[PDB]
Amino acid sequence: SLKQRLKGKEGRVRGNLMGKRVDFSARTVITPDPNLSIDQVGVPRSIAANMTFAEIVTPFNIDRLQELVRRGNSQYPGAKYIIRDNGDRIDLRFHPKPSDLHLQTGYKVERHMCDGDIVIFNRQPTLHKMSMMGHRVRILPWSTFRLNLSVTTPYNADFDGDEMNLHLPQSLETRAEIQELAMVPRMIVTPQSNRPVMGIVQDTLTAVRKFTKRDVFLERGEVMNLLMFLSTWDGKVPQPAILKPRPLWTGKQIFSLIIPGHINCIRTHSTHPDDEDSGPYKHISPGDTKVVVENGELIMGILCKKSLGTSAGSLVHISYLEMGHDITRLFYSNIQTVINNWLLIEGHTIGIGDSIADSKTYQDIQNTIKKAKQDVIEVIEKAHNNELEPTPGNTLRQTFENQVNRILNDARDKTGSSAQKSLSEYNNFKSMVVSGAKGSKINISQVIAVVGQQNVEGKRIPFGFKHRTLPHFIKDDYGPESRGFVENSYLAGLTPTEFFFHAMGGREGLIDTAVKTAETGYIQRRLIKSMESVMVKYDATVRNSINQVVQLRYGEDGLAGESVEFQNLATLKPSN
Amino acid sequence: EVAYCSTYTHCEIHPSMILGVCASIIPFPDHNQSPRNTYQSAMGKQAMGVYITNFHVRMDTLAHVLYYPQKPLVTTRSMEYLRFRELPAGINSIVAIASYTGYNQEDSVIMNRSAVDRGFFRSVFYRSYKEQESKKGFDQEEVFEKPTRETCQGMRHAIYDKLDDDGLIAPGVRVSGDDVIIGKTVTLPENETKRDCSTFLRTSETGIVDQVMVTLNQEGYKFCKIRVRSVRIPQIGDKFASRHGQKGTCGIQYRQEDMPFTCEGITPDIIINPHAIPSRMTIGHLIECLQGKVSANKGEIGDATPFNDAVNVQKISNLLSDYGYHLRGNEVLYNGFTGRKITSQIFIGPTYYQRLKHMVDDKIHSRARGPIQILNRQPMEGRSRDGGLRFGEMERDCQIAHGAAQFLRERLFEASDPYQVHVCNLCGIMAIANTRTHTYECRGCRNKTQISLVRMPYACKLLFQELMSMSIAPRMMSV
């Protein structure tokens, strides 16, 4: 019915008016490309050949467009159509008369997409504003869109079968709009959290931590090669940190050439000892933490997620705030290229040697588990004798579960800490966790020491069978193993009952992901529809479509969210 | 023992039987995270291998068969009853977990191009097209014949030379996109000759005809099935996954010279990023690499049953130490470009890698001024129909956030469904307009002078007309 057509989603009101299928759009699998800049995207030649951007013939560009017209559709840098002044369209594929090929001012030649053509890149779902960013086009000879790795974080895209949509603006006006509003370098900093959206990620973060250690010393030829990939190099080789006996540069010395202009920043490495700041060696840091950049030169410190990641006050954030968006784009790209070429010399890997720990550490983990199981048994015996006293506001079952969970969690965390103590400097799990590129201390602990308690619906594994978790366990068994505690690590391998309980926990995780996607989508749509028309007028009042004043000044101070920074008042706290 | 239960009434035959068919192919399942086993269960259904031994006789749509399937070097005991050895899906591949050039970052994979040239992960894609000669129409007969442009009033300019006399292309003839696989003609009633009814190849198939069959179907009409074969050499978009839930496309392909090489001369067939392992905690992958190294050297297929208690990482490590390698499986690698030893020692070992059905060639689509729908006069939908990608409501909200009003306007009006209507000034209802006659008149006012041209999406015109059919009057007034 008419009401059925209009009412539902995919109806005329929403499925055909608010959103609709569009021309001049392309889609293909995305794959990485560290060599492309932040703003560049790699487009296959077939997608580039099908999509055409109409160019008006001017006295300036008549020769170039004439050559494109002569090439035709077959040769790649060609023109698919000619649009005359009358509006007549001459498709060049079917034979055009040699008279028709002649061009005059006012004709519109529809050239194939060429290098440097601004396009809009999208990945569904388009949750935030950074999910649609303008990319320059670079044509490369395979059939996948290729984008830089730093740009993956705004899109929330990884290269495991993902796909992205390419929209080509067809007019100079809309092309200028994209170029000056939505290009990738212009949206490095999000107004949502006044932090940079994009940061150094994956191999480059892991390797920048290693590159910036005090230990790293580079010889002459390696410095030559690293400087070769630096786009903004002045052409002057820095004086090596160690002139004699053999000229040897340092990783920080080369990274100082990457840092844009003169940027001053102080951040702390992840492994910074808390006592260091108060005690001596505060400035001459024993562990080479406390990153300090003065006059755009890395005086000291080990770079990590905190210094080069997506956080307020990062080196990239200070670069965007101080140097500008263009120099910051160059900064991102140069970090990636130089560090990735050093990683060929140094290399990274993950093996079983990383998971395995010392025999003493394994014995310590086993002892912690033994005494934890004994403690749980003691609590159970107290409960059976009714000696246990209920916690206020909780039933005896609830307080028994609380105490048992506390004991098991303390054992789990202590075993994790023992495993993390065992890790050597060379351990690669530790490299990735410390750099912040991937992983967490929890994952290391589960790999090496103890997987941990399996909880479903916020409780230990429930009694699915009559008064027992599995048929193999005795009825009314509240012990650690029966209710889901997985003593073995992933490296050690789970026992079969622990395997089933672990499967139950993982299933809860999967279900939570599936449900959260839908519910969050609905919430986001409702918020947008409620606040879509609110904007800052030229009075600087924030008014809706009805012109009712939502706010007299935007944010009550009339400032935009990206420019602002965290600061301390310093008059508030001190005593009189 | 220390008394736990003295009244056992039954015993499990083997705990590994709790897993299903797809989960039984995972080696060392107990050493993986649970979501990763769940993901491998779904990826294993999509892998490429010889699906059945009678695949030559069968004419199925979308059949992929790998050139050189190999049985796993590290196999579960329950795989024997699944017949995975008889019909394997995947190739054991020398895999290095390393960061080489940044093209394996995220989940992508660097593949060896020399290995790909030697037959590594090469597959064939068979597509079958079926057509039926239907004479059921009263005066319509869908005869099989080669259409002729002069004889048939309805025709298309795609190549018709391939078709033989019967209207079916002979096997062994190359077919490029937009070629006529089957030529069929419907005789046209002469109300007062021919509307073309040929079937055309899916774009970019670029295959060679394998088998052409002519039979009579259940209805008794003549039935023709044509199977087109396309070889599929792996590219830099194809999706490869291991048996431990690690999926990823091919980031780039380096030749054997460029790939890092051990001192023995072994260059990894696949290089995966070390960043995939820690967050996903698929240690079964690492243990499988170690056991595969030991198995390849020893010459016996490794046992990876889930719960064994006789196979430990330490035992596998000592076994590997016996064969002259580092006990944890690491190897000293040399950089292919410069020859210098890589300072870190890279973890190299054979690992069963699968090739999933998702390939970039099947997933690449581009649209520019294509056909439009009848109802909405908007671009079609789908890769087969050359449809444009949808600019959803979330996308328009992002563009509103940007402040790109004109890009939003182009994308939502000018690119999709531009249209013009004529609207009476006195009454907002649309008015009849003869551009060729140059007379524009509005019914209901008997007014000709006051008419204005309005540019609106065709979808909006359809919305307003559907409102009018519901007796709602959407009077759009320019004033």
């Binding site: 969970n405 098991l408 969690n409 789990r412 929890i442 589960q446 997987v451 941990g452 308690q453 399996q454 909880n455 479903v456 916020g458 409780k459 230990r460 997985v486 672990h502 926990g505 993982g506 809860e508 995780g509 939570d512 | 995270q33 649970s34």
Partner: peptide, 8 residues
């Protein structure tokens, strides 16, 4: 899969 306070 860790604990009651962590993740499943």
């Amino acid at each position: 899969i860790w604990g009651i306070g962590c993740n499943p």
